[PDB]
Amino acid sequence: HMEAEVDKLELMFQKAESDLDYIQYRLEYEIKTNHKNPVTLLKELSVIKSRYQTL
């Protein structure tokens, strides 16, 4: 009974997961297919914002 209801809830969550999983899978695909980045840009900006005050 409620066990059945819960079986549903679990089923839904599992869907939501594979939903999310797909969205991700796609983004990764669009990403792979094309060819800077903010990551190294921060490191560079700290190297400058530092040796400016040093200098």
Binding site: L20, Q24, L27, E28, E30, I31, K36, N37, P38
Partner: peptide, 12 residues
């Protein structure tokens, strides 16, 4: 996702 999202946005 949101990170891999911004990675796609910013690179496309």
């Amino acid at each position: 996702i949101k990170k891999t999202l911004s990675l796609r946005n910013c690179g496309q």
